[PDB]
Amino acid sequence: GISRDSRHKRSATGAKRAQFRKKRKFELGRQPANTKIGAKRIHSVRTRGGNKKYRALRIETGNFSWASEGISKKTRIAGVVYHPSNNELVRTNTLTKAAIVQIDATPFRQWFEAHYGQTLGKKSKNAERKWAARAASAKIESSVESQFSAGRLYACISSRPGQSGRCDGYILEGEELAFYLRRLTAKK
Amino acid sequence: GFPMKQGVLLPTRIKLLLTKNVSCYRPRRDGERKRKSVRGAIVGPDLAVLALVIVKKGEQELEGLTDTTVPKRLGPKRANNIRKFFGLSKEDDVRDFVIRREVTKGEKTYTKAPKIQRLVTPQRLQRKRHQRALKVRNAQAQREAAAEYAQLLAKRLSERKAEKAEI
Amino acid sequence: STELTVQSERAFQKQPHIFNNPKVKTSKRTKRWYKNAGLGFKTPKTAIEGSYIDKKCPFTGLVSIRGKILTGTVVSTKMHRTIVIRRAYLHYIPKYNRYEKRHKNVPVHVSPAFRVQVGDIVTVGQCRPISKTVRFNVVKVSAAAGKANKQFAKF
Amino acid sequence: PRAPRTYSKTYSTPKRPYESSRLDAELKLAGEFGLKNKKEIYRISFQLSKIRRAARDLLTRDEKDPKRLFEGNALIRRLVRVGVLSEDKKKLDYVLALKVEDFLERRLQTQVYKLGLAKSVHHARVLITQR
Amino acid sequence: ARGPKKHLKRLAAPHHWLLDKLSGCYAPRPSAGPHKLRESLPLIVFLRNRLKYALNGREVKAILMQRHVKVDGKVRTDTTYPAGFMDVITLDATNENFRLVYDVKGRFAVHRITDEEASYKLGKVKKVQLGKKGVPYVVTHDGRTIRYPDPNIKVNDTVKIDLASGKITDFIKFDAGKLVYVTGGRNLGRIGTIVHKERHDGGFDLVHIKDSLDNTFVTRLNNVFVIGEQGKPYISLPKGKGIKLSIAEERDRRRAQQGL
RNA sequence: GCCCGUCGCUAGUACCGAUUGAAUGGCUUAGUGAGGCCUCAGGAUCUGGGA
RNA sequence: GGACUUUUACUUUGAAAAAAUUAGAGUGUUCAAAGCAGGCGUAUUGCUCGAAUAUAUUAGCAUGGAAUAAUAGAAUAGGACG
RNA sequence: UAUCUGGUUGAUCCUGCCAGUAGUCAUAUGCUUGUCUCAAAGAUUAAGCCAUGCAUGUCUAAGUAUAAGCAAUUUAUACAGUGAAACUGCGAAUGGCUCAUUAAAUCAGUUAUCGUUUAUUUGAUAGUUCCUUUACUACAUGGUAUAACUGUGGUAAUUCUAGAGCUAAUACAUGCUUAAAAUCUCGACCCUUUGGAAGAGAUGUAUUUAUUAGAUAAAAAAUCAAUGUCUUCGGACUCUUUGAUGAUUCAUAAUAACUUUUCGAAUCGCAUGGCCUUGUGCUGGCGAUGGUUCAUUCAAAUUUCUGCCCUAUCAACUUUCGAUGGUAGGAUAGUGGCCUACCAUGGUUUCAACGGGUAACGGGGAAUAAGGGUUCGAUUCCGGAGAGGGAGCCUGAGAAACGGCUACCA
Numbered sequence A: 001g002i003s004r005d006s007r008h009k010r011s012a013t014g015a016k017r018a019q020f021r022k023k024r025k026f027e028l029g030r031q032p033a034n035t036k037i038g039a040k041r042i043h044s045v046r047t048r049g050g051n052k053k054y055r056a057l058r059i060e061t062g063n064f065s066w067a068s069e070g071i072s073k074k075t076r077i078a079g080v081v082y083h084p085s086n087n088e089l090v091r092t093n094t095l096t097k098a099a100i101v102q103i104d105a106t107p108f109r110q111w112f113e114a115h116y117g118q119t120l121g122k123k124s125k126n127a128e129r130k131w132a133a134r135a136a137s138a139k140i141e142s143s144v145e146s147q148f149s150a151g152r153l154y155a156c157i158s159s160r161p162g163q164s165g166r167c168d169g170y171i172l173e174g175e176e177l178a179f180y181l182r183r184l185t186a187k188k
Numbered sequence B: 001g002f003p004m005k006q007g008v009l010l011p012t013r014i015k016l017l018l019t020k021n022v023s024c025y026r027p028r029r030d031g032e033r034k035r036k037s038v039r040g041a042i043v044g045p046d047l048a049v050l051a052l053v054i055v056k057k058g059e060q061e062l063e064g065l066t067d068t069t070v071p072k073r074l075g076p077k078r079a080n081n082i083r084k085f086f087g088l089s090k091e092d093d094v095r096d097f098v099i100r101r102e103v104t105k106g107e108k109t110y111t112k113a114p115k116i117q118r119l120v121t122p123q124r125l126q127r128k129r130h131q132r133a134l135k136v137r138n139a140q141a142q143r144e145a146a147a148e149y150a151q152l153l154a155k156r157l158s159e160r161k162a163e164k165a166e167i
Numbered sequence C: 001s002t003e004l005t006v007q008s009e010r011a012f013q014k015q016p017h018i019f020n021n022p023k024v025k026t027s028k029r030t031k032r033w034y035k036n037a038g039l040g041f042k043t044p045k046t047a048i049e050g051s052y053i054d055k056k057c058p059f060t061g062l063v064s065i066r067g068k069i070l071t072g073t074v075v076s077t078k079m080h081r082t083i084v085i086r087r088a089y090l091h092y093i094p095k096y097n098r099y100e101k102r103h104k105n106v107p108v109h110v111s112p113a114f115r116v117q118v119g120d121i122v123t124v125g126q127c128r129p130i131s132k133t134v135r136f137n138v139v140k141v142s143a144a145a146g147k148a149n150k151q152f153a154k155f
Numbered sequence D: 001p002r003a004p005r006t007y008s009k010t011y012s013t014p015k016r017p018y019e020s021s022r023l024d025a026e027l028k029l030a031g032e033f034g035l036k037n038k039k040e041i042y043r044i045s046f047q048l049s050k051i052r053r054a055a056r057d058l059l060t061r062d063e064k065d066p067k068r069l070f071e072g073n074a075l076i077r078r079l080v081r082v083g084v085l086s087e088d089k090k091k092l093d094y095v096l097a098l099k100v101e102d103f104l105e106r107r108l109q110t111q112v113y114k115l116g117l118a119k120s121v122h123h124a125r126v127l128i129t130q131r
Numbered sequence E: 001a002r003g004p005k006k007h008l009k010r011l012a013a014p015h016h017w018l019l020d021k022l023s024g025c026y027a028p029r030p031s032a033g034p035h036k037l038r039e040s041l042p043l044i045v046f047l048r049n050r051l052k053y054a055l056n057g058r059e060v061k062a063i064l065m066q067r068h069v070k071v072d073g074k075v076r077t078d079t080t081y082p083a084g085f086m087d088v089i090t091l092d093a094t095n096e097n098f099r100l101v102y103d104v105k106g107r108f109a110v111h112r113i114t115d116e117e118a119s120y121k122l123g124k125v126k127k128v129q130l131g132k133k134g135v136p137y138v139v140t141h142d143g144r145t146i147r148y149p150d151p152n153i154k155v156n157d158t159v160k161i162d163l164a165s166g167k168i169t170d171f172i173k174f175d176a177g178k179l180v181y182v183t184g185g186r187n188l189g190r191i192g193t194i195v196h197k198e199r200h201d202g203g204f205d206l207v208h209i210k211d212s213l214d215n216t217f218v219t220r221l222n223n224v225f226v227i228g229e230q231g232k233p234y235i236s237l238p239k240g241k242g243i244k245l246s247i248a249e250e251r252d253r254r255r256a257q258q259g260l
Numbered sequence F: 001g002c003c004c005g006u007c008g009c010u011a012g013u014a015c016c017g018a019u020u021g022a023a024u025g026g027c028u029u030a031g032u033g034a035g036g037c038c039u040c041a042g043g044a045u046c047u048g049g050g051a
Numbered sequence G: 001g002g003a004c005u006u007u008u009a010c011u012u013u014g015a016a017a018a019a020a021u022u023a024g025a026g027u028g029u030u031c032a033a034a035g036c037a038g039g040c041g042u043a044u045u046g047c048u049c050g051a052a053u054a055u056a057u058u059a060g061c062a063u064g065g066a067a068u069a070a071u072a073g074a075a076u077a078g079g080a081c082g
Numbered sequence H: 001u002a003u004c005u006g007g008u009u010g011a012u013c014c015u016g017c018c019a020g021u022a023g024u025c026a027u028a029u030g031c032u033u034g035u036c037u038c039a040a041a042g043a044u045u046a047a048g049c050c051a052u053g054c055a056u057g058u059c060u061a062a063g064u065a066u067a068a069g070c071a072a073u074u075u076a077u078a079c080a081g082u083g084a085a086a087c088u089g090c091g092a093a094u095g096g097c098u099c100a101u102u103a104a105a106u107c108a109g110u111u112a113u114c115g116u117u118u119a120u121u122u123g124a125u126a127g128u129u130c131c132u133u134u135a136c137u138a139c140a141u142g143g144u145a146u147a148a149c150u151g152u153g154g155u156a157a158u159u160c161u162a163g164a165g166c167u168a169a170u171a172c173a174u175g176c177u178u179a180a181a182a183u184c185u186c187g188a189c190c191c192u193u194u195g196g197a198a199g200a201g202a203u204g205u206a207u208u209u210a211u212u213a214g215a216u217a218a219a220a221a222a223u224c225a226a227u228g229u230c231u232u233c234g235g236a237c238u239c240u241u242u243g244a245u246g247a248u249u250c251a252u253a254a255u256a257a258c259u260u261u262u263c264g265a266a267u268c269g270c271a272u273g274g275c276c277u278u279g280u281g282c283u284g285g286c287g288a289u290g291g292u293u294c295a296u297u298c299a300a301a302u303u304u305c306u307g308c309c310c311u312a313u314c315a316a317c318u319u320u321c322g323a324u325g326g327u328a329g330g331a332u333a334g335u336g337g338c339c340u341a342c343c344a345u346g347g348u349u350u351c352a353a354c355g356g357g358u359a360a361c362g363g364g365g366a367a368u369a370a371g372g373g374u375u376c377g378a379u380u381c382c383g384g385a386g387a388g389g390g391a392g393c394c395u396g397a398g399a400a401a402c403g404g405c406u407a408c409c410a
């Protein structure tokens, strides 16, 4: 099928290289997962030497990490908003690594308020203890508190769904969220 | 003589591409497909034979079929299969309820029964005993050499606090 | 090569797993990761000082140097972040018991930490295939220029 | 796919084919030791010239050089052994000298005659070849 | 070429085996195991070409299949089984125990060793790391994995091994002035001491060496195998104690030994 | 005495040359496109959403 | 371990190195081309020498040399040590 | 192992070729042909075509046996000896042959994997599996559905197979489990402190992600936000723990979670014994097959430096439809323009690029013997490529396999 050899491909001098031997199965390559949104559906693929690889095609939930918060939840993936490599990925809502997506927010809400006792946006015994043991550590951040209003947080895909069948990432923040923000709107 | 092949429709013949686990094909090598012809699943006058199977028996005995009745060759061989052909509860002991087949050797009439498999026997339990035992035996073993090494490092830090108490 | 902007890509540029928690107010903004590639090459402070990202930096990237250590005079600086040196050498023809001038043009990747101009002698280090052609990396600049600021105007 | 069976020739052949004087010298040699063809001479002088080569070669390397001592004595001792080389001239410029007849005088063909027992270098042959 | 090669052409066989050119056209390809191809000695070679104990190889099968032979303690039934350096071959009949060990010419010798020295082996930790669950381990040149070694123990040090039980009883660091046995090169089989070690960051550390004859030489550190103190070796060395005489020297000793 | 060329004979080689001459082999634009693999569907039937 | 090193060519020595082939030692295949054997006894219950050495280069590595032959440095001092 | 000789003239000395001469692990052919040993051999031309036969099959006490098979004997009324067939397992990816293509390709010497996959062998390695956690989940062992066979058939034809009826497992598919401990989160109550607490759950390994640890370039101080261990209640913190490399985000570990959840023995053989509260209770010897991770070994894939024959009547080559590089992704076992998207304008060249030729596989080597050279290597060892020409793919640890398949061409 596809061959990752370099023995086609003109020489750096520009010369044309002859055919030497036929395609080998080990220099092969397979097609793209082009994994998309919704209804979990994955196909294991027999790679070299035993070893499955897991091709995601349609994924709808994934594990996402509040980085500056040291937790993680799985949430629905709302969809794709930005992609540095190809725009058609955004338009087809294709999940790939480095994709920029939106996620369910609320499970990160449910945790926060139950951990800080503060509620985003806009009375037990030892509970009060903990909530008051924290804060001065609850300040969150202007543009990350914001997104909660919408019930949709911006997060970068970090996994390689074509490979692992997972669709995992981290909520955007700080300097990095600042980047995609500026990008997102001055094109919107 | 090309065989029909269920679920291909058509009252004609076509050339399919068959694999392991499928009608009209016995592969000859681990993961081999040969491309063979096939008659469709739609009855036509081009057939030599229909294979048919009674489903409801009408009003008149059909001589060589209803009138006569052949037995099943083999009887139950696994543990519970016996239990399930006779209905016994894991209690009634299979070893008598296995099925015995007579045979004569000129003037010696023989008797031969299966070999219940998956039968729970003392030998099995013994091996089950040894499994669990060795799993734990080494468990503790590993914990032993474990703390045996923690010492080596602990009275090495007393050898580095008597070395650092020398000079 | 780089210079300016730093964040001039469609992708956000950053070092992998070098987190900065915005919760924790800082005076340097971005924590940076660098290494000493070994073999006796000082990692120029302009790698530590700098802001460039470059995942192929032998000092601030995930490339590692090992194998051949070569030197050549820089002969072309026209490709972004990679140059092409010319290593020359005399070759022995034994029937004639004499030598002849040959050469090679090894293409090598160069980290923003160095600023190189054409003519400079360089010292490169082998690494994994980094591109179609480059299998080496600029690891020290030996020269400086060619006494250039002493080629100026009138008295 | 099996090992090589190795072989060699055992003789050289005269540059000029027809030196009337070399043929004289040769046929003399033959009928004097009862040999059948010129090859029996071609054989010897060949191995004779390789010896002289080795010698020549060695006699360039330093006196008391490692090789020409090890391989030096080896050559000398082997020659002296079979009784070609003379005991006195035991230091390998005689090996450089030497000559063909010296080798000739040691064939069992010839000894079988030299000490009685044959009276003719030819009776020598026949007897030997006749067990 | 599509897969593991399973044959050996006698000719491509390791030469220090001393197999004759003809009489066949294959040699035995050593099996997979504890030591590398190019540096082992299969049971078929030791039991037939050294020991002269079998004639056929078919016989070497019949011998081994009786569990007679046992390597490093365990039984070892494989005809081709790769036997390497420091291993312990023990014929249970005959009472005989051998430690595989090098000549000076550079081959394995038939070296009869004591019934009780045969109860332990020597081995060079080629590496040490940190394993699963934080357990550290060393791995010797025969692929022995030994968990929980000594903190002081690290690569290029040699180790004394019980064989009986798997574990290590002693070790010897790689110091200036320790006994050393060259396991490769044209100095393969030589023995002695260590002058000093040239470093060279990037690869190939040199090892300057002298023996009990004030003779020097150099090998790669990979080819070096610590084995004790000057004088005191931790194993019985074979005759000629790996000292290497000149060809002319050896020519004299063999033509001094002459009087019947 | 030697000796040069046209011209005439016999033989042989190579050239030029209407035939927009001919053959073989290697790449290749364009059009057409088998088959397997991947993929969206499909559900003969066959049991628990999957086969 | 820190802090730094103007560039080469040549040349010496050494590592790392397949065997067969070549050169070559040992050995009476009856000679020899070969082969890697074989040789000694208590030849009734074994003793024992062997299976060398060299070459192996252009490149790469390691190292001794500092002639020959290049290259770089302090002149708008934008020098050198502190 | 450093040699020449015949031929231009009437004669002469030179130039210079032709001729002679010698060898060829260098083919053929002619004539002749007795002995020993040794033994190459359809390479060259047509990698042109092939009748027929043979060249890959395989069983241990030890996965499966109701042959309606043999043997009967020797204890065996579940099984037991031997064993067709068939299932299961493993091998068929080695070997053997050929030199077609191939000129910076192969190949060689020399590097790299801090850039990967790896059956096997060898060494190491698993108390964690269930569930809102008293009227419980088969563990004294859970599920069917198939070959072989039985029988009914089809075709001129094949290593074609159909309909029916059976029945196995180390096939297929399921699914129980085991010490103490500690650490984490929750936290019913009580009581105001300086604050503590019943008890509730989570915690095998593997997978995916994010965050930490992984020190060391010689020594010290203050304060902010939390919050560790010991009171002699102003307070002190004193001993404090560190693996490898030239070098890492390494080896390894910790935190929050993720999974159509990887693995954690429903397997088989020889023996049959201890021990009492006599439950056929509880235990228990030797070793086979396995099983995850690591290591090792057999490998493999890429890979740095330098080195190829003739050719300028080949001087500019390279980016259509990647040519050189950057970012991101995808794809792979993995690096990488390998592919895609975006972006730039690069890369090579008189030190010969690019193109052409090769009656070109490369090497170890072979022939010729002053030396320097010249010529040769299809061909006993190594590497490589192919199996009529192309492409595609299944199986698998490993094939782009051809004594495997699918297609097109011939």
Ligand SMILES: [Mg+2]
Pocket (backbone or CB within 6 Å): B117, B118
């Ligand atoms: Mg069973």
Ligand SMILES: [Mg+2]
Pocket (backbone or CB within 6 Å): C078, C079, C080, H325, H344, H345, H346
């Ligand atoms: Mg550019």
Ligand SMILES: [Mg+2]
Pocket (backbone or CB within 6 Å): E006, E028, E029, E030, E031, E080
């Ligand atoms: Mg073998």
Ligand SMILES: [Mg+2]
Pocket (backbone or CB within 6 Å): E202, E203
């Ligand atoms: Mg290294």
Ligand SMILES: [Mg+2]
Pocket (backbone or CB within 6 Å): none
């Ligand atoms: Mg026409």
Ligand SMILES: [Mg+2]
Pocket (backbone or CB within 6 Å): A031, A032, A033, A034, F039
């Ligand atoms: Mg697709």
Ligand SMILES: [Mg+2]
Pocket (backbone or CB within 6 Å): none
């Ligand atoms: Mg040298």
Ligand SMILES: [Mg+2]
Pocket (backbone or CB within 6 Å): none
């Ligand atoms: Mg030799």
Ligand SMILES: [Mg+2]
Pocket (backbone or CB within 6 Å): H007
């Ligand atoms: Mg004449």
Ligand SMILES: [Mg+2]
Pocket (backbone or CB within 6 Å): none
């Ligand atoms: Mg005349």
Ligand SMILES: [Mg+2]
Pocket (backbone or CB within 6 Å): H010
């Ligand atoms: Mg006249």
Ligand SMILES: [Mg+2]
Pocket (backbone or CB within 6 Å): none
């Ligand atoms: Mg001539």
Ligand SMILES: [Mg+2]
Pocket (backbone or CB within 6 Å): none
């Ligand atoms: Mg042919």
Ligand SMILES: [Mg+2]
Pocket (backbone or CB within 6 Å): H043, H379
């Ligand atoms: Mg041939």
Ligand SMILES: [Mg+2]
Pocket (backbone or CB within 6 Å): none
């Ligand atoms: Mg053919």
Ligand SMILES: [Mg+2]
Pocket (backbone or CB within 6 Å): none
């Ligand atoms: Mg039976």
